[PDB]
Amino acid sequence: GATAVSEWTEYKTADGKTYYYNNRTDESTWEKPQELK
C-alpha cells in the first residue's frame, strides 16, 4: 500500500483518517485511488 502518487496525495486528519486529494481534478475523496491502491 503506497502513498502519494503524483497528482494524488493523502493527508491524515486529527480524527485519525486520510483524505485523498487529486490536484488537477481538485477533488477530495476518502476512498483510496486505484492508481494508489
* Residue at grid coordinates 491524515: 12
From 2, 7, 16, 14, select the one nearest 28 (Cα to Cα): 7
Q: How many CB atoms lie within 10 A of CB 8?
A: 21
Domain boundaries defined on the chain? 1-37
29 — phi, psi (to 5°)? -125, 150
Alpha-carbon gap, residue 11 to 8, rounded angstroms = 10
Cα angle value 28/31/36 (rounded, 5°):
95
Alpha-carbon gap, residue 6 to 13, rounded angstroms = 20
3-state SS assignment for residue 28: strand
33 touches 1 (CB < 8 A): no
* DSSP codes joined into one string, 5-27: BTTEEEEEETTTEEEEEETTTTE
1-37: which CATH topology?
Answer: Ubiquitin Ligase Nedd4; Chain: W; (2.20.70)
